[PDB]
Design a binder for this molecule. Structure first.
Ligand SMILES: [Ca+2]
Length: 240
């Protein structure tokens, strides 16, 4: 997250760190949202590589013991069947990870609330992106979870010529674009939390940013629209 502020430890308890084994160690690669005690919603592109993954819930500082972490293997990965790694702009950048064990819920580990199917937010709706991704374009990962206020940019504006044009689809949510705050590499897969009827819900799964850089004016961060996938999500959970 570029131009973020450090999140309070108990702010975003559905945020997870998706990590892959790297030698004798584990490296953060993407975010995710805990949606059941044994399921995590993330981006499909986060799990294209044939790597060994684990999920960390209750995480705050990647590099220090917080006293609140639970570590769990990924047992099954279900990518959306229409995802095509060659074509992020086509959409479908979403995957569900079934965890090897159910995690324990507490102040630091909670299920992410999802929107009702089909819900579209009005332009400029209040949302926060959270994650441990790069804090600058071509920078380094955050040590502590970051949040940035990123108001939505509705489809009509987001798919206009000076914004994303044809690259953005109605199956996506755009947010931000102010040239200062943005998602960045390593936030992919994580939540965009939007306030609706008094309650934050996870409306987006971070998907992509401009090839030109993370915080680019009129190139808001782009998220898979969760509310476009509620049936798919329910179907996968029910059959696994
Ligand atoms: Ca930690």
């Amino acid at each position: 997250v570029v131009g973020g502020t450090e999140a309070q430890r108990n702010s975003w308890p559905s945020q997870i760190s998706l990590q892959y084994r790297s030698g004798s160690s584990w490296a953060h690669t993407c975010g995710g949202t805990l949606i059941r005690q044994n399921w995590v919603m993330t981006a499909a592109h986060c799990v294209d590589r044939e790597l060994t993954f684990r999920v960390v819930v209750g995480e705050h500082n990647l590099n220090q013991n917080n006293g609140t972490e639970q570590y769990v293997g990924v047992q099954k990965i279900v990518v959306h069947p229409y995802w095509n790694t060659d074509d992020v702009a086509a959409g479908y950048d979403i995957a569900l990870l079934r965890l090897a064990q159910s995690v324990t819920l507490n102040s630091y580990v909670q299920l992410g609330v999802l929107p009702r199917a089909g819900t579209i937010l009005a332009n400029n709706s209040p949302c926060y992106i959270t994650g441990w991704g790069l804090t600058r374009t071509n920078g380094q990962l955050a040590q502590t979870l970051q949040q940035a206020y990123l108001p939505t940019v509705d489809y009509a504006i987001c798919s206009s010529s000076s914004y994303w044009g044809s690259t953005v689809k109605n199956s996506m949510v755009c947010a931000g674009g102010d040239g200062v705050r943005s998602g960045c590499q390593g936030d992919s897969g994580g939540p965009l939390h939007c306030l609706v009827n008094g309650q934050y819900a996870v409306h987006g799964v971070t998907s992509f940013v401009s090839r030109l850089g993370c915080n680019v004016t009129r190139k808001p961060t782009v998220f898979t629209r969760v509310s476009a996938y509620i049936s798919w999500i329910n179907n996968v959970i029910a059959s696994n």
